[PDB]
Write a protein that binds this ligand. Sequence first.
Ligand SMILES: *[C@@H]1O[C@H](CO)[C@@H](O[C@@H]2O[C@H](CO)[C@@H](O[C@@H]3O[C@H](CO[C@H]4O[C@H](CO)[C@@H](O)[C@H](O)[C@@H]4O)[C@@H](O)[C@H](O[C@H]4O[C@H](CO)[C@@H](O)[C@H](O)[C@@H]4O[C@H]4O[C@H](CO)[C@@H](O)[C@H](O)[C@@H]4O[C@H]4O[C@H](CO)[C@@H](O)[C@H](O)[C@@H]4O)[C@@H]3O)[C@H](O)[C@H]2NC(C)=O)[C@H](O)[C@H]1NC(C)=O
Ligand SMILES: *[C@@H]1O[C@H](CO)[C@@H](O[C@@H]2O[C@H](CO)[C@@H](O[C@@H]3O[C@H](CO)[C@@H](O)[C@H](O)[C@@H]3O)[C@H](O)[C@H]2NC(C)=O)[C@H](O)[C@H]1NC(C)=O
Ligand SMILES: *[C@@H]1O[C@H](CO)[C@@H](O[C@@H]2O[C@H](CO)[C@@H](O[C@@H]3O[C@H](CO)[C@@H](O)[C@H](O)[C@@H]3O)[C@H](O)[C@H]2NC(C)=O)[C@H](O)[C@H]1NC(C)=O
Ligand SMILES: *[C@@H]1O[C@H](CO)[C@@H](O[C@@H]2O[C@H](CO)[C@@H](O[C@@H]3O[C@H](CO)[C@@H](O)[C@H](O)[C@@H]3O)[C@H](O)[C@H]2NC(C)=O)[C@H](O)[C@H]1NC(C)=O
Ligand SMILES: *[C@@H]1O[C@H](CO)[C@@H](O[C@@H]2O[C@H](CO)[C@@H](O)[C@H](O)[C@H]2NC(C)=O)[C@H](O)[C@H]1NC(C)=O
Ligand SMILES: *[C@@H]1O[C@H](CO)[C@@H](O[C@@H]2O[C@H](CO)[C@@H](O)[C@H](O)[C@H]2NC(C)=O)[C@H](O)[C@H]1NC(C)=O
Ligand SMILES: *[C@@H]1O[C@H](CO)[C@@H](O[C@@H]2O[C@H](CO)[C@@H](O)[C@H](O)[C@H]2NC(C)=O)[C@H](O)[C@H]1NC(C)=O
Ligand SMILES: *[C@@H]1O[C@H](CO)[C@@H](O[C@@H]2O[C@H](CO)[C@@H](O)[C@H](O)[C@H]2NC(C)=O)[C@H](O)[C@H]1NC(C)=O
Ligand SMILES: *[C@@H]1O[C@H](CO)[C@@H](O)[C@H](O)[C@H]1NC(C)=O
Ligand SMILES: *[C@@H]1O[C@H](CO)[C@@H](O)[C@H](O)[C@H]1NC(C)=O
Ligand SMILES: *[C@@H]1O[C@H](CO)[C@@H](O)[C@H](O)[C@H]1NC(C)=O
Ligand SMILES: *[C@@H]1O[C@H](CO)[C@@H](O)[C@H](O)[C@H]1NC(C)=O
Ligand SMILES: *[C@@H]1O[C@H](CO)[C@@H](O)[C@H](O)[C@H]1NC(C)=O
Ligand SMILES: *[C@@H]1O[C@H](CO)[C@@H](O)[C@H](O)[C@H]1NC(C)=O
Ligand SMILES: *[C@@H]1O[C@H](CO)[C@@H](O)[C@H](O)[C@H]1NC(C)=O
Ligand SMILES: *[C@@H]1O[C@H](CO)[C@@H](O)[C@H](O)[C@H]1NC(C)=O
Ligand SMILES: *[C@@H]1O[C@H](CO)[C@@H](O)[C@H](O)[C@H]1NC(C)=O
Ligand SMILES: *[C@@H]1O[C@H](CO)[C@@H](O)[C@H](O)[C@H]1NC(C)=O
Ligand SMILES: *[C@@H]1O[C@H](CO)[C@@H](O)[C@H](O)[C@H]1NC(C)=O
Ligand SMILES: *[C@@H]1O[C@H](CO)[C@@H](O)[C@H](O)[C@H]1NC(C)=O
Lengths: 176, 127, 113, 134, 221, 48, 31
Amino acid sequence: KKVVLGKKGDTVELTCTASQKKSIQFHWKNSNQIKILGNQGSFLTKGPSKLNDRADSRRSLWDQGNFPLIIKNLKIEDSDTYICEVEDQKEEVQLLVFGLTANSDTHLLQGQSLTLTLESPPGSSPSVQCRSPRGKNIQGGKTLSVSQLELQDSGTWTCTVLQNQKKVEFKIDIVV
Amino acid sequence: AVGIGAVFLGFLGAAGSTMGAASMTLTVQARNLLHLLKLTVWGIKQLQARVLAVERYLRDQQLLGIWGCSGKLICCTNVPWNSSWSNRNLSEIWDNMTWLQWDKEISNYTQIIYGLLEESQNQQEKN
Amino acid sequence: FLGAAGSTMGAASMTLTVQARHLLKLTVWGIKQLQARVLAVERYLRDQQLLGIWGCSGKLICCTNVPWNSSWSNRNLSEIWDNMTWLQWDKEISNYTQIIYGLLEESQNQQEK
Amino acid sequence: DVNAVDVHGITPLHLAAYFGHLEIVEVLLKTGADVNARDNRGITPLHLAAAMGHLEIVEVLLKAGADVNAFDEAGDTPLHLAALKGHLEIVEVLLKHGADVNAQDKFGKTAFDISIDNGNEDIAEVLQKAAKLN
Amino acid sequence: IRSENITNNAKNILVQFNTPVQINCTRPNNNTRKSIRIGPGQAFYATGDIIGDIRQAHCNVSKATWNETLGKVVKQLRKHFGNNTIIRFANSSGGDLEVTTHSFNCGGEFFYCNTSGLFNSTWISNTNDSITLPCRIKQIINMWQRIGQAMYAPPIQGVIRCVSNITGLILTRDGGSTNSTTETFRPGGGDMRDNWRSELYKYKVVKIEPLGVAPTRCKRR
Amino acid sequence: NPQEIHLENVTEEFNMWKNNMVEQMHTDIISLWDQSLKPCVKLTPLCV
Amino acid sequence: LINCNTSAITQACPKVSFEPIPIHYCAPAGF
Ligand SMILES: *[C@@H]1O[C@H](CO)[C@@H](O[C@@H]2O[C@H](CO)[C@@H](O[C@@H]3O[C@H](CO[C@H]4O[C@H](CO)[C@@H](O)[C@H](O)[C@@H]4O)[C@@H](O)[C@H](O[C@H]4O[C@H](CO)[C@@H](O)[C@H](O)[C@@H]4O[C@H]4O[C@H](CO)[C@@H](O)[C@H](O)[C@@H]4O[C@H]4O[C@H](CO)[C@@H](O)[C@H](O)[C@@H]4O)[C@@H]3O)[C@H](O)[C@H]2NC(C)=O)[C@H](O)[C@H]1NC(C)=O
Ligand SMILES: *[C@@H]1O[C@H](CO)[C@@H](O[C@@H]2O[C@H](CO)[C@@H](O[C@@H]3O[C@H](CO)[C@@H](O)[C@H](O)[C@@H]3O)[C@H](O)[C@H]2NC(C)=O)[C@H](O)[C@H]1NC(C)=O
Ligand SMILES: *[C@@H]1O[C@H](CO)[C@@H](O[C@@H]2O[C@H](CO)[C@@H](O[C@@H]3O[C@H](CO)[C@@H](O)[C@H](O)[C@@H]3O)[C@H](O)[C@H]2NC(C)=O)[C@H](O)[C@H]1NC(C)=O
Ligand SMILES: *[C@@H]1O[C@H](CO)[C@@H](O[C@@H]2O[C@H](CO)[C@@H](O[C@@H]3O[C@H](CO)[C@@H](O)[C@H](O)[C@@H]3O)[C@H](O)[C@H]2NC(C)=O)[C@H](O)[C@H]1NC(C)=O
Ligand SMILES: *[C@@H]1O[C@H](CO)[C@@H](O[C@@H]2O[C@H](CO)[C@@H](O)[C@H](O)[C@H]2NC(C)=O)[C@H](O)[C@H]1NC(C)=O
Ligand SMILES: *[C@@H]1O[C@H](CO)[C@@H](O[C@@H]2O[C@H](CO)[C@@H](O)[C@H](O)[C@H]2NC(C)=O)[C@H](O)[C@H]1NC(C)=O
Ligand SMILES: *[C@@H]1O[C@H](CO)[C@@H](O[C@@H]2O[C@H](CO)[C@@H](O)[C@H](O)[C@H]2NC(C)=O)[C@H](O)[C@H]1NC(C)=O
Ligand SMILES: *[C@@H]1O[C@H](CO)[C@@H](O[C@@H]2O[C@H](CO)[C@@H](O)[C@H](O)[C@H]2NC(C)=O)[C@H](O)[C@H]1NC(C)=O
Ligand SMILES: *[C@@H]1O[C@H](CO)[C@@H](O)[C@H](O)[C@H]1NC(C)=O
Ligand SMILES: *[C@@H]1O[C@H](CO)[C@@H](O)[C@H](O)[C@H]1NC(C)=O
Ligand SMILES: *[C@@H]1O[C@H](CO)[C@@H](O)[C@H](O)[C@H]1NC(C)=O
Ligand SMILES: *[C@@H]1O[C@H](CO)[C@@H](O)[C@H](O)[C@H]1NC(C)=O
Ligand SMILES: *[C@@H]1O[C@H](CO)[C@@H](O)[C@H](O)[C@H]1NC(C)=O
Ligand SMILES: *[C@@H]1O[C@H](CO)[C@@H](O)[C@H](O)[C@H]1NC(C)=O
Ligand SMILES: *[C@@H]1O[C@H](CO)[C@@H](O)[C@H](O)[C@H]1NC(C)=O
Ligand SMILES: *[C@@H]1O[C@H](CO)[C@@H](O)[C@H](O)[C@H]1NC(C)=O
Ligand SMILES: *[C@@H]1O[C@H](CO)[C@@H](O)[C@H](O)[C@H]1NC(C)=O
Ligand SMILES: *[C@@H]1O[C@H](CO)[C@@H](O)[C@H](O)[C@H]1NC(C)=O
Ligand SMILES: *[C@@H]1O[C@H](CO)[C@@H](O)[C@H](O)[C@H]1NC(C)=O
Ligand SMILES: *[C@@H]1O[C@H](CO)[C@@H](O)[C@H](O)[C@H]1NC(C)=O
């Protein structure tokens, strides 16, 4: 029951597991049993889904026994389970995609408040732990707000989002 | 595969027939047994197939003649039949069953059958 | 059939029962392989035709009632089965090989009678 | 053959630059294909690389020493065909590799005039920036 | 139709035809259009035209015969599913060019044919034209034998022609949990073992054990 | 001349997807295509 | 970083004629 996390725009590598080392037929299905990829001989066959143009695989690893899943331009509606069908296995992975940002882009001053915005996928409750170069280790739930924003709080704050003992880091645009 | 390789599948006919009929027709089926690149390169391959058929036939005939039945299609041997191998009547096997299902029955036992036949022939030659 | 000759007499007597179970270039070598296989089969059938006289046809281990002189073996014969191999034993009785074959064939002749 | 030529002067490097296969381009470069192959119609692999919009093969060819100001029978630079099909990134690639903005074809068509006749404004602005910094 | 497993979208569905669908195809001997271009980019336009017309071909398929064949196919395919359920075809979803397009060789020259105009269909239950498929010759081919790519010799200038049957068909069902309706079928293939299974479908190799052992009432010696 | 013998009363499983016959046909066709069609450029990935 | 280096082979490539022919498979002796 492995789970991986995204950064809403990067790439995620989901791998299967094989041992016969013969480039056996495999596929990729979600929880609705919709095809995503699949090996037909030595070619690549993209499945008829909403993940058509951005899904990819590393063809050089197929003879070794690894069948990866590379997804570019990651978005929040793709947070769903995925199934490997190498031989007769039914190994499953979970993808957790969210985004953390702010509302004020550039227009900020000295001595105001700061607000965050986290778009969590439906069916999750992550925890945001912020870390500041000034030492403001803000602990809280999903939504976080900072009541002080002055000149010494400049720099990109690293608010990491943890769930299921797995955490990923982000950046915060502060223009004063 | 002409000749001996043809008669390896020659007795394959009537495989689903009655157990008592095939054993009588073994004798009849055995009685029924009877340009540059073509002859230098192509001919030696059919020669290999024919000599492989002859080698297989002599290997099978030698394995049959271990038990004192050289040249005999049907031979009776003094090995007693253990009841654990079959535990069934003599009538129903020869009146109902076929050869394929019977070898599916005795595939577990035929390995020790061949060894006990070899040991019985060895004991016959010892006395 | 010449393999596993390092074993002794009593071991070979058991293992014989175990034994019971560029185009012109390729053609001229395959034809010599065919000579080897066909003359091996022909020698096997010739030896079986020879053995059919002695009554042991088709049988690897046989027994006869042919009398054996103590002068041919010239040995107590108890220790030839465990520590002495076949190759030395064939050279022991190489001078006396044809007369015992002649003894077998006439012995089978009164066995017919 | 690596340097194979047909009756039309078209090389396998021309085909690999047209169809956008980077691996075949790199492999033919490693085996020793001509980076400045000339045909009967004056087209080098750099024109076919620039016109279709494949930045990788353009970088690979310009990193091997292809002529940045190659002239065909029509006098067109690869920058002209880069700006004709609306490929902006290719245009600052050949401006980073040193293409002349004042080059003329056999009809009198500049890359600025190519960009403004095609209604392409962002190409014209960045090449005017490059010509101002020349 | 033959499959490992109906109602599993991973396995291919091989379809065998009782009647052959004749497909015939040609490469033209020379260029026919020879367009004249005055505007800028004329040298690249002429070079693209000659290098595109050196590799262009078309395949003709009889429309009525292939339509009646797929009319048999849809009636056979409605047996394994519901009769009232609408089933229909679609073109290839995406992937490599050997999967998205038809790939076959004539005289050592590779043809990639666009079968999107062929598989256009829709069907509702209880209710001399010749179609042309544009085919292009691609030099860069993903090998079916091994992972990798290959580039071969440029095509021969002479006219090349292939007239051939259509014996079998390869399908992948889009498995979908959307009301069990509008079952779409897309062409697949690429694994050549599936191609050899479509002709070696009724054959099995066995060895012979002629030695038999039986009990009886006989006696020996 | 082919020899073809028809059986009378027989019922045998003819599972063809697990056929071992194909995993030989496929290797024979790979051998044929490797002997016959030699490409001008052949690229294959090799991983350590 | 996993070492995955593509190997390229340049070979002489003449023109050949392609025509598939019907082939049978024959079982060996005893089969
Ligand atoms: C399914 O099966 C079917 C049938 O089983 C397949 O259909 C077959 O497809 C084949 C591929 O095209 C095709 O083969 C061609 O046939 C041509 C005609 O053959 C007849 O004429 C010749 C000569 O008179 C006779 O010897 C022969 O017995 C026939 O009666 C051949 O001419 C073709 O050979 C040419 O092409 C190959 C392609 O690689 C060359 O290697 C070869 O050297 C030949 O090259 C000549 O022609 C080309 C093109 O014209 C020229 O560029 C070249 O320089 C040569 O030119 C000479 O000859 C031409 C006249 O052709 C002349 O003008 C010139 O001056 C030169 O003298 C080729 O062999 C089958 O006919 C066809 N079968 C049927 C029944 O239609 C189908 O493909 C299969 N499906 C799949 C998917 O494979
Ligand atoms: C052939 O295809 C059928 C589909 O028609 C396969 O049957 C499917 O098998 C899976 C795994 O056994 C089933 O998933 C299970 O579903 C139950 C709820 O129904 C759930 O509680 C389990 O945890 C599991 O996820 C699936 O339902 C089932 N589908 C159907 C329609 O029966 C079958 O495995 C394939 N292979 C063979 C050899 O038959
Ligand atoms: C199967 O058929 C469909 C439709 O008949 C084909 O879809 C077409 O796909 C191409 C690209 O693959 C689309 O072109 C795109 O247009 C957008 C427009 O904004 C452009 O931004 C893209 O860069 C690209 O040029 C085309 O629009 C689309 N057709 C339709 C009607 O949506 C599909 O390619 C066919 N598949 C096969 C394997 O033949
Ligand atoms: C196989 O044939 C079908 C149609 O017979 C092809 O679908 C057509 O593909 C072209 C280009 O991919 C589409 O043109 C597009 O038009 C939009 C809007 O004008 C434009 O923005 C795009 O840049 C592109 O030019 C076209 O709409 C689409 N459909 C039809 C009905 O023509 C298909 O692409 C062919 N397969 C292959 C592999 O080429
Ligand atoms: C028939 O075969 C069974 C074994 O399949 C024999 O059973 C053995 O009998 C001896 C005593 O007679 C026991 O010591 C063994 O433990 C038994 N089992 C085995 C596996 O040897 C049985 O004796 C045989 N009967 C005849 C008449 O030969
Ligand atoms: C769906 O269509 C099939 C067509 O094959 C119907 O099958 C027929 O069923 C009747 C009644 O059992 C038989 O007499 C016919 O021989 C069948 N075949 C044909 C070709 O008519 C089937 O009944 C239909 N309905 C369902 C619910 O499956
Ligand atoms: C696939 O089929 C659809 C309809 O099922 C076609 O769409 C129509 O095409 C005709 C002729 O091109 C147009 O006159 C219509 O306006 C189209 N739309 C409708 C709603 O009828 C489509 O062109 C077909 N595609 C191919 C490649 O054959
Ligand atoms: C395509 O299918 C047709 C069947 O309609 C084939 O025609 C038959 O070919 C066999 C093979 O020699 C002949 O024995 C028959 O007499 C032919 N029948 C007719 C009606 O002509 C045709 O040969 C097939 N095409 C190919 C290339 O095999
Ligand atoms: C096959 O079975 C039928 C069933 O009645 C029987 O009549 C027929 O004789 C059998 N075939 C043979 C060769 O015995
Ligand atoms: C075996 O045969 C005997 C005598 O014919 C009979 O009494 C017995 O019921 C039979 N047993 C079975 C299992 O057929
Ligand atoms: C013969 O075998 C069949 C199948 O095992 C069985 O149904 C039938 O009763 C048997 N008949 C006799 C007479 O034993
Ligand atoms: C024979 O061996 C097979 C091996 O799998 C076993 O399944 C079967 O039960 C055995 N039969 C008997 C009668 O021992
Ligand atoms: C030994 O050989 C002689 C012949 O030289 C023979 O007469 C005799 O019977 C043989 N046997 C014995 C025990 O002497
Ligand atoms: C032969 O060996 C046995 C056993 O050691 C011995 O009793 C006998 O005396 C020996 N005979 C001769 C002639 O050496
Ligand atoms: C066999 O006869 C030859 C003839 O001279 C002799 O030299 C040899 O020693 C004999 N072998 C024996 C007696 O074992
Ligand atoms: C090209 O093909 C056309 C077909 O109409 C023909 O008229 C013309 O002479 C051809 N040109 C050549 C072979 O140069
Ligand atoms: C294919 O059909 C079209 C229909 O207009 C026709 O023009 C063309 O000549 C045909 N081609 C062949 C090779 O039959
Ligand atoms: C090609 O196919 C079309 C449509 O089936 C047919 O009309 C035409 O006669 C064919 N041309 C041949 C066989 O040369
Ligand atoms: C194909 O056949 C169906 C019914 O057989 C018919 O409704 C449809 O119009 C046909 N299509 C063409 C293009 O002839
Ligand atoms: C049909 O499918 C949609 C999409 O999953 C679903 O929302 C709807 O409830 C389904 N309707 C029925 C009647 O199953």
